[PDB]
Structures are given as C-alpha cells and as structure tokens.
DNA sequence: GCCTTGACCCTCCCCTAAGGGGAGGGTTTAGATTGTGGTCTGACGCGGCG
DNA sequence: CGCCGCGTCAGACTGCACAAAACCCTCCCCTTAGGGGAGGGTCAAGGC
RNA sequence: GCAGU
C-alpha cells in the first residue's frame, strides 16, 4: 500500500483480476535506507 | 530472500566497488537545457539514464538495443529507475576523518589509539604533530608535538624520525598499530591492575580491540579516503511548475566537498605554501563532516535560507528520519478519513460508511466486478463507469463490500482497540456512523473527531480484520479483563430509569403473567414502569452437567425491570436486572453474561441492552432544568456561621493569641468544614426530596431528580460537579498550589462574581495546561515501553518451572486495596494451594485461576497463593504460554505467538493521560501477630520490641489479614502477640520525634569512655528537676572522644559483668552525636524502657520507577549477614563494617555521617535489612534480595500511582516491562567458558551458555543481574536495526559498525522496517516454518 | 453470513491457524476451481470458509490431505 | 448563528455523545445554509516545448 | 466472372554532413587598498578534569 | 568525589496557507542540403 | 505559523 513499487502495482492488477493475493518485496524507502546509510561511511548489507 | 542485514565499515575498495563512476565535477544539470552534465553530481553516463530506455544524446532510444553503453554519450541504455540505485564517489585528495567515529563519544579512534579526543583534534585540525614512529629516540608514538618542538626534534633527530600533522597522521597511527599484540598486551596489564577505574578502561579498550580483529573490519577505515555519492534520484533536483527548481541539501553539501575538493588538488598542483594547503585541507575536513553530520562539530552550515543544512545524518535520525517517518509508520493507500456520528441503529460488528467514501476506497474492486459481470468491456470502460457513477455502479458496490470488514481507527492509537474492523453499511451522508457501545474504546465524542478508514486487500487480511480485529472479538479489555463495550451515559440512564420504582405509581400492586404482559400494560399506558409489581419469572440456570434448567416463581418485581428481563439471554438469573441498574450493574451485567454464557449470546445482550437503553431514555424525557440544582436552603446559614467563625479568628490573630501561620490553617480548615456541610445538606436535600404518598401516609423515596438521576447512574457527573451546580464550589488554589483563604461561596446556579470567577480559571488554565503538556509525556512513556518490550512474544506452551511470586491482598496500612481474587485471576498457580487446614491440596499446582477457582478460593480463606510469572520464566527468547496465564482480552489461557510485550506496553501507557503533571490503632477485630520479632517485657507490662523491622498484621478468625501496620523500634506494644483488640483501640504507641535505645537486659549502669567535659557535657534546666547529659557533636568535641567512641554498657551490683542470654560479647550502647540523657551514673533501668533519646507521584513517578534511576538519598541495606561495628571517622564518611563469623567477615562502607543512620553496633543484620532510612534504589533490590523482590517492588511502585487515579491495569502488564528491563546479566566469574569477568552479556546468552556447558561436565559461568531503564535496555539490545530505529541512530549505527554487528530479524521492529511478516500472530507459523527450514 | 467466528476458534484451537486455514481454502474457492462444501447463501470466500470450519468439514489436515490427493490424482495421468 | 428552539431531552440516541439531532425544518428554511466562495486559478505558463 | 504475388514507378521521411552563429571558456589588466561577523529549556546520563 | 561541559530527548492524526570588462578562441546548437531508405500508387501474370 | 480531535 505504501512502498512495494513492483508490490503496489501487482497488488492492483489483481484486485482488478479478481485475485485478492500480495507479492510483497521490500519497501523501497528500506533501500533509500540502505542507500542514506551507505552514504555514510558505513556498509550495511543484506545477507543470505 | 535474506535472513540478516550485517553492518560494518566501508572500506575505500568497498566504496569504489558500490560506485559507477567518479563525481569529478560540481556540475549538477545544464541551465540552457535541463539535461545533466557529464562529470557531475547528475550524471547521466555515472548514475544511468535520464529517461527510460534513452541514452542522453538521443541517438539510441528504445529498448530493441538495451543495455548498451551509447559511444555519443556514455550512458547505458536501461531504465532510469537505476538513478535510484546507483552511487558515485569522490576520490578526497587528502584523507578525512570520518566524523561519527571521531566525535561520538566515546571516540572510536580515540578510545582506539588510547589518545584523548582533544589531542586527536588538535592533530587533524593541523594545530599540532604527532610522532608516528619514535626509531632510535626518545619521542614515543602518541607524543604530540608543537610546531617549534617539531623543528628542534628536527634539529636534535634529523630524518630518523617520522612525525606528521592532520588525518594523515591518525590514519598512519591507526594504519601502524597492531591490534592483536597490544590487545594481549592490555590483557597482560588489566591482569596485574587492582585500579578499578583503569580496569574499566582498559576493558571497554579491550573489547573494542577485540570487535575489531574478530570482525574484518581495519581502523583506517574510519579516515575517509574515498566518499561515497547518494544517488541522484534520492537527492533529486526537481524544476517546480514555476520555473524554479528544488533541490535537497545533499546536492549543496555534495558540491561544497568537490569544490573544496579540486581546489585542493588545484593547489597541492600549484606547489602552495603549506599555510594555504593546510586551511584547504582543513576546510576539506570541515565540507566532509558538514556533509555526513551537520552541526556535530561546531557550528552547522546554513545555506541560503539562514536555516541549517540537512546532512546525511539528519536524513536518518529523529522523529523526521526515515527510521520513524517512513519506515515504522508511513503514508497508505486505500484509506480515507472523515467526521464520525453515532448511528445508534447499527449492530455492534457494523459501521456506516459515505457512500462516496466506500466508492473511492473500492475502486478497483469495482472495476474488476464491472470487468467480470460484463457490464464494461475494459477497464477504461469501467473507469468511465465509475465516474459517471451510473445506477449500476451501486449495485456493484453493494455487491463488493458486502462481507468486506474495513478498519476504522481514531488517532491517537491509544491501545490497540483504537483500530477496529466494522462491516460497512452504505449510507449516504459524509460523515461515518460509529456505533456507540465502542464509542468508549476510542476515546471518541461526536464533537468534531475524525476517523480514518482503512480497506483490507487479500483474503488474508480481510479474514484477520473478520476473526482478530472485528468489533465483536473486542468486547473485553487487553488491560483487565474487563469489558470495554460497555453501556453509557443514555443508554445507563435510559436502563436506570426503566429499573427503578416508585411508590405509589399508576398500576402498583397487580399481578403479572409475565414480562409480555408488562410491557403490555406499559405501552396501553395502564401501568407506570415503575409500579411495584408481581411477575411471573422463568429464569434458567445452567446445571452442573452444562444445560438449561428452568424454573417459574412470582417474582416482586416493578414493571420496567419486567420488561428488561425480555431481552436477557437465558442462563442469566433474576437477580441480575431486580435492582436499579447504574453503570456498574449494568457492566456487571454484560461480565456476567461473558462468563456463563460466551461471546455469541454477549453481542446479542449487548446490542439490546443499548437498544433498550436508548429507548427508554428517550421515553423517560429525561431533562435538566434550572430547577433541577436544587441549592440547599442551609447554604446561607452556614456559610454565615462560616463567616462568623472565620470573623472570631480574625480578631484571635489581630489580639495576637495565634501566628498568621496557625490562623491560616484554622480559616482554611473552618472553610472545608463548612464546604462538606453545605454539600452533606445539599446531598440530602437532592437524594430524597421526594416524598409522596402511599394509601394517604407520607413516605420519602430516591429523588427523580434528574440531575440525580444523571449522577446516580453514573451515566454522566459525581457529586463532586453536583456539588459545584447546587452547593458550593468551595476553595480554589493560586497558580502555584497554596489554597486560597477565602472560597468560591457561590454555585454555578447562582453566579460567580467577577473575583470568584477570575479565582476560579486560576485553577482551570492550570489544568488545561497540564493536560495540552502531559500528552506528550505519557506518548514517549507509551513509546519507550513499546521499544523496550516489543519482542516479547508467547513462544512456548510452558517451561516447567516451579518458580512464582506469592501473590497476596494488598493491605496498605489499616484497609485492603486489592483482594487476593482480581490478583489472581487468571494466573496459573506455581505450587498445590491446600486449605489451612493442611494435606489436601485445595487447587492442583498447574491450574489456571479462572473465576470458579478463584470462588473456591474464597470460600475457604486461602489469602496467599504462589503464582507463575513472566520474570521468572525459563523460556529463553520469549515467554511460555503458562507463565504469562490468561490473555485478558479472551478470558482463556493465552495462544502462542501473542506479542504480549506491545500489549502489555499499550496496557501500561494508554491510561497515561489520567495521570497528573504516632501510635497504630486496629479500626476492626481480629487477633494481632508480630513478624521478625524480638521481643521483651517493660518494667510495667507493655511489649516491648528490640526489633527494627518488626511488622504487625492482624490475623483474622480465618487466618487472612485484613490490615499490615509498621511497629517502629523500641515502641511498647500494650498487648501480648495473638491477643484479640476492639474496633478502634490502639495496640502500639512510641516517640514519634526522636529514636530511643532501649534497654536489652535489666542491668547497672557502665560508662565506659563516657568522659565527663571530653565526651559528656552536663547541662542544666529548672522544670526538669535533674541534671541532663549530652554526648558531643564531631564539631563540639575536643580532641579525643570522637575516635574512642564514648559507651553505656551493662553490670550488676554484684561487680559482675551482666550480658545477653547466650553470648558472651560485651553488651555495649554506642550512642552517636546529637543524642539526651537525663541519666547518672549507676542508676538502675530494667529491661523494657529507654535509655537515651535522639532527635531527627503521578506520570513522572511511573516514568522514573520503568526508567529505573537511583533516588536522591537512597536507603542503605545491608550487603551481606554479619554484626555492626565501624571504624575510621570524621573524613566526611563515618566506616560501617559488616562482620559475618562465618566466613570472609569484612565488608566496610563508607556511610556519610551525615545521613541519620538506623541500626545500633550489636545486632545482627541480613541482607536487604535498611541500615539507613529512604526510599530504596531498585538496583539495590535487585542485587540483595532477588529478582522477585524487585519485581514487587516495582508493581507495587506502579499500581500504587495507577490505584489513585482508579485505573486498573492487570499485573502481568507490568511484570512483562520488569522482565524486559532486567534482561542483562554481568560476568562476575568467566567460568569455563567464552565470556570476561565484569562485561555485560544478554541474560539469555549466559544461560544457555551455561546449560550446554553443565551438559558436557565443565561448570558454567556465574552471573549478577542487571536492571536497566527501559531506555538503556531498549538501546542495548542485540538488535541494532531496533536500537537504531529508537533513538540515538549514531551512537548506535557507530557501535554497531565498529562491532561488525549482525542483525537477524528476529523482534518485531526489524520486520516491520524491511516489511516482513512480523513473527508474532499470524506471521509466527510463517516464521517458525522459515526458521526450521533455514536451519536444516 | 458471520458476525462472530468464535465457533470457528473452537474447531481450530487458536485463532491465528484459524485466520491461515481460512485464507488457505478462502484461496481455493476464490481463485482455483474448486467448490464449497457448504450451501454459498451469498457469501463471500472468506465468509464460505469460516462457515466450513465452523461445521467441522475444514481444517488444516483436512485440507492437507485433500491436496496430497488431488495432487497424487493429477500425477496419476502418466501418458 | 441563528435562534434554533432546542429541547433537552435524549432521542433515541440520536444526541449520544454531544451529537445534535437536528429537524427538518431547518435545512428547509435554509437556516445554517452558508454561501462560501473559492477562487480557482489556471495558469498558462511558458513551457520549454 | 472475381482473388494472390510481383512489377515498376512515385512520394515522403529520417539520418548524415557541413556551415553559420551564438555560446561558453580563457587570459589579462600595474595610484594604494593589508586579521570577518543571538542570549527566551529543563532533566538526565556520562565523561573528563582537579 | 565535586563539578562543569556536552549530548539526547521532549504524543499522534488532520486541515489552512504554501516557495568588470575587452578581446581570442574553440565548441555546440540551429539550419539546410543531400541521400538513403521506407512505404505508397497503379497495374501484369495466374489462380479461385 | 493558525486551528480541529
Ligand atoms: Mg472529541
Ligand atoms: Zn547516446
Ligand atoms: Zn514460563
């Protein structure tokens, strides 16, 4: 509702196909995040 | 996808390998032509493509050919949401240091370098040189120079030595050093230092060594070299409408650092004198760190609206960072917002939602049900449809929202019933319709509130808001068990009215089929709702077995109650609606029926008692007139003896007989007597003016008074307002608190005078004032618990511990405040509870006290019952189902995966706004016991109790005790121990104003370096008769006597030294300074009587019992369990020393003297006993007398402000915030194992750690507990994503990178930031699936 | 139609599974073929569900053991 | 504001709350009817294409 | 008695090269100029001096 | 130990109205001609 | 800034 870019979208297109279902990614103000902190001198990372 | 987000340090690879490109040029965008210019802070060739699919000269520009790095221009052919993602970086011609990891403190490369910050500035603000190799010479490593000791260095050492200035210098010093040899290095030297102070500095250095070689971080990396570039679409430069453009400060910052940046290479080209590269360098410094965080050093950098920049640290941090404002909360589609009214025809699961509201938030719904039944080809088509809102629009939105819950929600979210799902019914107007039953759980009048509504998309949050959030799920409270849809002011006062009776009313005395004939006789107008009446009842009870089982009697009954009793659901008794029914009945009423008969039948009773209620108070015409203040035709009369009396004592203080001090007091307690008077009148005159006939006989009645009857139900007022309309509203205060002498003589029926008036909005501006600031203190208390205790989540179904509090009544002094039953409630028992009488256990040990244990234990008069608790839960990481006991909300025994720690936070700070800014006599029988006694018989016949910590409670006939006083030291006790008192007699009396020694055995008197004139001055006085003594003050003595402490001991005539009965210790009386003795020498005092004579709340007390902080003067307890005796003196600190003869015995304290202290040199003490008096530190608590007793203690602490205010929150709330708070332990032995002795590990850590060494044979560590602020506990979590998001994001971030921190996600906070399932509710299964299948 | 789901809370011990299994057979019958098992009085998926594991024909092993069949049913076409 | 004759009595629960019921003779004799006026700007600028 | 596949010729449109001109970056000036400009918060924890 | 200096904190939602100059030299953009290509117009053969 | 809850 807020920040999945890709998320929102998807999320709408199946309201429309009758298909009440999320995909949620990651909230794209987390990466404006992780793109202010980097800005710093400091590695924040996401592990796997 | 990924299961930890790992913090660390940049290194200058790491940030050249993030970047596409170096930002070698200022430049942002081209002024003629918008496009961005090559080199520069928008770069098109670095940060990607301006447009989609569109290289910056046009040549390439569809997506046939993507990917392609155009030759023209440079930049890739891709889409242009990469400027989102894609960082530049600038290559600093001179190392910078890093300003987080120099200025907030502690500095990370000072505390590295073991060098002060003050010299480290000094070295890289170019003021001083640094030896960064000493060689063959004397100059050390860390040895700073001045410019002048530079050159004679220079002169005596010549190029042996290396010393230099600025960021390179620390960058070589931190470049040079070597961390794991002088990490054992300091080990070596922490091993042999005693010096406590340098044991905690070398082991916070030593830690941070250590973070740092066993993470990959180096310490050159704190000295910036290459700076990383934010990408340009999150700092973007946007032309607004009007031609002008809008930037961020990022952009300014960014263009100050390559400014300052190409002019230092510029000049270090030029070959500049080293004055000019020094300020370019220094200047450099000073752009980069008003860059990464504005205004941390200094002054901030204003830019061109004299207000500060906004640096990269200001993006992150505070309550406008990105933390708090857009990751935590944030702005959401599908919501709407609008004025709330009362629809009082809804049923309680349904709101009333605008039509126009509910076609815009289900707007797309709408479209995919036109798409699918036809009646639009398209979605443009649709589209079109619902614009027009054509007739068939409506039956597709009829159709859409049909069993669709939406969220309803009233900011401030207070609790979590401040968000509740309703089924929409569509009205027509602009306003949504509230039912009224959950008017009370949002805090929400009709007066203007607004409300926002929010749309559930998928089946998975539409079937949360239908099974968790929906209104009827909702209709007890999380607090206390209590219900929250609750009947209010109309609905009380219409339930009230129909209830009552009257005595002579239309259709009195005749007999009834039933209620349906009642109601009959009530619509035909042939009998009043409250003739007294007979009714034939049939009530049902629910049998042993668990059915129905009816029974008929003629019940003495009015016709109102008759007519109530039709919508009463079944297994309800008559009792239950035979009685004029205020608020509390009627909320008893609907607990009742939650109880017996469930949540199904509750709604139904709910939603007609509400129906009823309105009904009936709009037949009653209830109204309120100005002849309804009946004023008191006494008021005039006593407040003219009240003028009288306070005339008397105007010519008392004018004759001079009293002080202005006295005869204030007298006026204002002459006033306050004659203010209850004129309310005991006017009461008397409102309650029961009705007096009407029965068979021509007078007979007074309940007034019908309807302001009475407002009051009386509880519907709306208290006397304490009836008393301002038709008494007097009495003494009012000035702005600072002291009470005006004169009072408000008048009632707002009457007027207020101009001087009344003004007097009165002192007091009313005040309490307006501290209700607009206290808000905003009772949020951040609410936002702290939250922080501090938002992980926990039931996680378990038990732990099988045996551990528990002893929950008992609290009995504050002489009365009970809460009984045994709403303490218990709901918790399971930790032990069997047996009856007194003994071997037959009254409730097994592991059952959940729901309210027919509870009946059972109060039948018999069990009043101590050890409970489970969420302290003392073996569940590591979370809190078994049991420990935790009922959830409040449900009535039963709470579900796994409840986040009890956001509840119970919720619980504690949403009545925060409620908040604001000698002798002992027995009131009632029973028969007295004294506990930790000792005790002697007086020369009289009192009971005499050489005891300090003796406590009096009265054991009932039953065995419970109904009331706990504190019997001082010394006080006579006039009965003997289990002797049974008179209601209102007096048991115990003592001094009140000075402490006594008494005597311990009959014995002859001993002075013992009582020195006459060195130690003893004799003092004279006529009215006593006989010569008195003093020992002397430490600044009245000579030398001498101070240091050889002056003693009053025991003989016998005999010459024989007389002592205690089973010791032969010399008894002694050490009598301190500022003591009296009207005693000679060998004078003769038996065992019982003295010897000598000494003389002596709100939100913020709440916030600083979680905050945990130590109190002014704190109480002294006793460490450990030895004798008293002391030593040196007179340094300001006289030396305690605690003895134990069976062990280890000195323990010494340095008690300052001037502290009056409590305990005599020749008892023996325990831990926790009060050596001296004050209120006691929790900390202390903690450390001496356990877990529990500070888990009592701060309950207790904490109910005692809620108790005042008549708010109840159950106990678990805040055993929950104890838990929390006390979740560290430190190291005192390391054990065999991994950790150090006085460092600070997670409680749950060490035992673990503890129980899988104890499993391979070797001994585990052992540990102290730690109780920490809610504050410094949430900010020492292991979680740095939930520390950073709290507050203090730098220190936090700095400490984190510097530690190489991992963060797995495991709270809730942290998966709420990445937007996750958080693992509590129904995002548990989720998680536990993904953590037993990422693990094996 | 629901107004309360606390029949469904007593066939599904808790309420969180409930809410899971609900939207797992609310997902069967709103987007996949499959019918409810209870007569659909204009009901919506989620409603439908509740109402199936109000009566006992719904829970999660019920539904698990339905999609092992269905599952070993349409591997069972091996040509 | 205009002289509305009110009477203090709970309807139905229409006045639940400081709620205020309201006939409607007062929206027929246009009463609190209020004539509010906004001023809508379209501006014709100068763009770059 | 009516449909494909070329066939030839015609027409316009987009990329490319060049030329004019506006634009934009650059270099140099020589009477003497010698150190710039709000304070309205209180409580709490901590850390370095003395 | 006392004390001073410094850093951190201070509710949540809503609207409303809003923000030196002069001369040289090269380089990039606008304009225009051209040329290639890429459709568009009107028929000549069997096939349908 | 100014109001509303
Ligand atoms: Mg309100
Ligand atoms: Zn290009
Ligand atoms: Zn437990």
New interface residues.
């Given amino acids: 509702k807020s920040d999945d870019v890709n998320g929102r979208t998807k999320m709408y297109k199946n309201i429309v196909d009758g298909n009440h279902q999320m995909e949620p990614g990651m909230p794209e103000s987390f990466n404006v995040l992780l793109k202010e902190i980097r800005s710093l001198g400091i590695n924040i990372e996401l592990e796997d | 996808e990924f299961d930890a987000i790992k913090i660390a340090l940049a290194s200058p690879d790491m940030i050249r390998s993030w970047s596409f490109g170096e930002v070698k040029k200022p430049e942002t965008i081209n002024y003629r032509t918008f496009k961005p210019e090559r080199d520069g802070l928008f770069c098109a060739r670095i940060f990607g493509p301006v447009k989609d699919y569109e290289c910056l000269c046009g040549k390439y520009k569809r997506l046939k050919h993507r990917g392609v790095i155009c030759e023209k221009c440079g930049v890739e052919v891709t889409q242009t949401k990469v400027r989102r993602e894609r960082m530049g970086h600038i290559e600093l011609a001179s190392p910078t240091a890093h300003i987080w990891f120099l200025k907030s403190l502690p500095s990370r490369i000072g505390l590295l370098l073991d060098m002060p910050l003050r010299d480290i500035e000094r070295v890289l603000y170019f003021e001083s040189y640094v030896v960064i190799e000493g060689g063959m010479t004397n100059l050390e490593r860390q040895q700073i120079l001045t410019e002048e000791q530079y050159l004679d260095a220079l002169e005596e050492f010549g190029d042996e030595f290396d010393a230099k200035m600025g960021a390179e210098a620390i960058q070589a010093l931190l470049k040079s050093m070597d961390l794991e040899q002088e990490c054992e290095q300091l080990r070596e030297e922490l091993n042999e230092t005693n010096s406590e102070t340098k044991r905690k500095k070398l082991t916070k250095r030593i830690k941070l060594l250590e973070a740092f070689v066993q993470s990959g971080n180096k310490p050159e990396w704190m000295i910036l070299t290459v700076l990383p570039v934010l990408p340009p679409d999150l700092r973007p430069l946007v032309p607004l409408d009007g031609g002008r453009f809008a930037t961020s400060d990022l952009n300014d910052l960014y263009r100050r650092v390559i400014n300052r940046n190409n002019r230092l290479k510029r000049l270090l080209d030029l070959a500049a004198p080293d004055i000019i590269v020094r300020n370019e360098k220094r200047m450099l410094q000073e752009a980069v760190d008003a860059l990464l965080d504005n205004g941390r050093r200094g002054r901030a950098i204003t830019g061109s609206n004299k207000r500060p920049l906004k640096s990269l640290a200001d993006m992150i941090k505070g309550k406008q960072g990105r933390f708090r404002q857009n990751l935590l909360g944030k702005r959401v589609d599908y919501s709407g917002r609008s004025v709330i009214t009362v629809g009082p025809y809804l049923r309680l699961h349904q709101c009333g939602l605008p039509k126009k509201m509910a076609l815009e938030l289900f707007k797309p719904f709408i479209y995919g049900k036109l798409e699918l039944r036809g009646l639009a080809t398209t979605i443009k088509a649709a589209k079109k449809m619902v614009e027009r809102e054509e007739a068939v629009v409506w039956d597709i939105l009829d159709e859409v929202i049909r069993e669709h819950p939406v969220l309803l929600n009233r900011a401030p979210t207070l609790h979590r019933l401040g968000i509740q799902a309703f089924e929409p019914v569509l009205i027509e107007g602009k306003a949504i319709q509230l039912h009224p039953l959950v008017c009370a759980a949002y805090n929400a009048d009709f007066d203007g509130d607004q409300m926002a509504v929010h749309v559930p998309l998928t089946l998975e949050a539409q079937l949360e808001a239908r099974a968790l959030m929906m209104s009827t799920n909702n209709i007890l409270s999380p607090a206390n068990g209590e219900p929250i849809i609750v009947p209010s002011q109309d609905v009380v006062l219409g339930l009230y009215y129909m209830t009552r009776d009257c005595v002579n009313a239309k259709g009195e005395g005749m007999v009834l089929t039933g209620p349906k004939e009642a109601e009959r006789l009530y619509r035909s107008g042939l009998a009043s709702l409250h003739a007294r009446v007979k009714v034939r009842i049939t009530e049902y009870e629910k049998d042993a077995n668990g059915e129905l089982v009816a029974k008929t009697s003629l019940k003495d009954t009015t016709v109102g109650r008759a007519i109530l009793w039709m919508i009463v659901p079944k297994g309800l008794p008559y009792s239950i609606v035979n009685q004029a029914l205020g608020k509390k009945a009627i909320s008893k009423m609907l607990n009742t029926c939650y109880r017996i008969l469930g949540l199904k039948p509750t709604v139904i009773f709910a939603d007609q008692i509400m129906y009823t209620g309105f009904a009936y108070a709009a037949r009653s015409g209830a109204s309120v007139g100005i002849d309804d203040m009946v004023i008191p035709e006494k008021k005039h009369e006593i407040i003219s003896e009240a003028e009288a009396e306070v005339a008397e004592i105007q010519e008392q203080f004018q004759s001079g007989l009293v002080t202005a001090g006295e005869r204030y007091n007298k006026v204002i307690d002459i006033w306050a007597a004659a203010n209850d008077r004129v309310s005991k009148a006017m009461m008397d005159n409102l309650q029961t003016e009705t007096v009407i006939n029965r068979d021509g006989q007078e007979e007074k009645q309940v007034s019908f008074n309807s302001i009475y009857m407002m009051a009386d139900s509880g519907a709306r007022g208290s006397a304490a307002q009836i008393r301002q309309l038709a008494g007097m509203r009495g003494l009012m205060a000035k702005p600072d608190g002291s009470i005006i002498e004169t009072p408000i003589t008048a009632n707002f029926r009457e007027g207020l005078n101009v001087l009344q008036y003004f007097i009165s909005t002192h007091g009313a501006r005040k309490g307006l004032a501290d209700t607009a600031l206290k808000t905003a203190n009772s949020g951040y208390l609410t936002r702290r618990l939250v922080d501090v205790a938002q992980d926990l989540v039931v996680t378990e179904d038990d732990c099988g511990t045996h551990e528990g509090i002893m929950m008992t009544p609290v009995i504050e002094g002489g009365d009970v405040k809460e009984p045994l039953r709403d303490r218990v409630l709901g918790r399971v028992t930790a032990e069997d509870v047996l009856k007194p009488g003994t071997a037959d256990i009254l409730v097994p040990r592991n059952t959940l006290l729901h309210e027919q244990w509870c009946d059972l234990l109060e039948e018999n008069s069990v009043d101590a019952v050890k409970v489970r608790s969420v302290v003392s839960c073996d569940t590591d990481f979370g809190v078994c189902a049991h420990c935790y006991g009922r959830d409040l909300a449900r009535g039963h025994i709470i579900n796994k995966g409840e986040a009890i720690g956001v509840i119970a936070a919720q619980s504690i700070g949403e009545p925060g706004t409620q908040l604001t800014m000698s002798s002992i006599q027995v009131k009632n029988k029973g028969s007295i016991k004294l506990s930790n006694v000792k005790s002697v018989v007086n020369s009289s016949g009192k009971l005499v109790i050489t005891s300090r910590n003796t406590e009096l409670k009265l054991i009932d006939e039953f065995g419970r005790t109904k009331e706990s006083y504190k019997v001082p030291y010394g006080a006579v006790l006039a009965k003997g121990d289990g002797e049974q008192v008179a209601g209102g007699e007096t048991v115990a009396n003592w001094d009140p104003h000075t402490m006594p020694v008494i005597t311990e055995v009959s014995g002859f008197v001993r002075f013992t370096d009582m020195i006459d004139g060195q130690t003893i001055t004799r003092q004279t006085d006529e009215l006593t008769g006989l010569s008195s003594l003093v020992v002397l003050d430490s600044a009245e003595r000579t030398a001498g006597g101070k240091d050889l402490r002056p003693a009053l001991k025991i003989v016998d005539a005999q010459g024989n030294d007389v002592l205690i009965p089973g010791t032969d210790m010399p008894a002694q009386y050490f009598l301190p300074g500022k003591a009296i003795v009207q005693l000679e020498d060998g004078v003769q005092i038996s065992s019982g009587d003295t010897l000598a004579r000494i003389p002596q709340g709100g939100l913020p007390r709440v916030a600083d019992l979680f905050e945990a902080r130590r109190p002014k003067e704190p109480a002294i307890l006793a460490e450990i369990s030895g004798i008293v005796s002391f030593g040196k003196e007179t340094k300001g600190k006289r030396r305690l020393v605690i003895t134990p003869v069976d062990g280890s015995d000195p323990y010494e304290e340095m008690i300052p003297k001037w502290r009056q202290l409590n305990v005599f040199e020749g008892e023996r003490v325990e831990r926790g006993d009060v050596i001296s008096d004050g209120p006691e530190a929790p900390h202390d608590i903690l450390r001496l007398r356990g877990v529990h007793a500070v888990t009592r203690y701060i309950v207790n602490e904490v109910q005692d402000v809620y108790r005042l205010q008549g708010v109840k929150i159950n106990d678990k709330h805040i055993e929950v915030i104890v838990r929390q708070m006390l979740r560290k332990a430190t190291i005192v032995n390391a054990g065999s194992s991994d950790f150090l002795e006085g460092e600070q590990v997670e409680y749950s850590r060490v035992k673990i750690a503890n129980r899988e060494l104890e499993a391979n044979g070797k001994v585990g560590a052992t540990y102290s507990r730690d109780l920490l602020g809610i504050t410094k506990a949430s900010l020492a979590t292991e979680s740095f994503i939930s520390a950073a998001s709290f507050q203090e994001t730098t220190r936090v971030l700095t400490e984190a990178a510097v530690a190489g921190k991992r963060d797995e996600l495991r709270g809730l906070k942290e998966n709420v930031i990445v937007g996750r399932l958080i693992p509590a509710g129904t995002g548990y299964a989720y998680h536990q699936d993904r953590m037993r299948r990422r693990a094996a | 139609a629901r107004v309360t789901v606390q029949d469904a809370v007593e066939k599904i011990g808790n309420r969180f599974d409930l809410v899971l299994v609900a939207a797992r057979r609310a997902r069967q019958m709103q987007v996949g073929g499959k019918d409810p098992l209870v007569p659909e009085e204009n009901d919506k998926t989620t409603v439908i569900a509740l109402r199936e594991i109000e009566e006992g024909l719904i829970n999660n092993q019920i539904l698990d053991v339905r999609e092992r069949q269905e599952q070993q049913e349409q591997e069972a076409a091996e040509l | 504001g205009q002289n509305m004759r009110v ?13 205020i019921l309201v006939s409607e003779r007062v929206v027929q004799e246009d009463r609190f009817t209020t004539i509010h006026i906004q001023e809508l700007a379209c501006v014709s ?1 100068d763009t ?1 294409l």
């Fill in positions: 009477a203090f009595m709970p309807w139905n629960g229409y006045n639940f709350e400081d709620s600028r770059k």
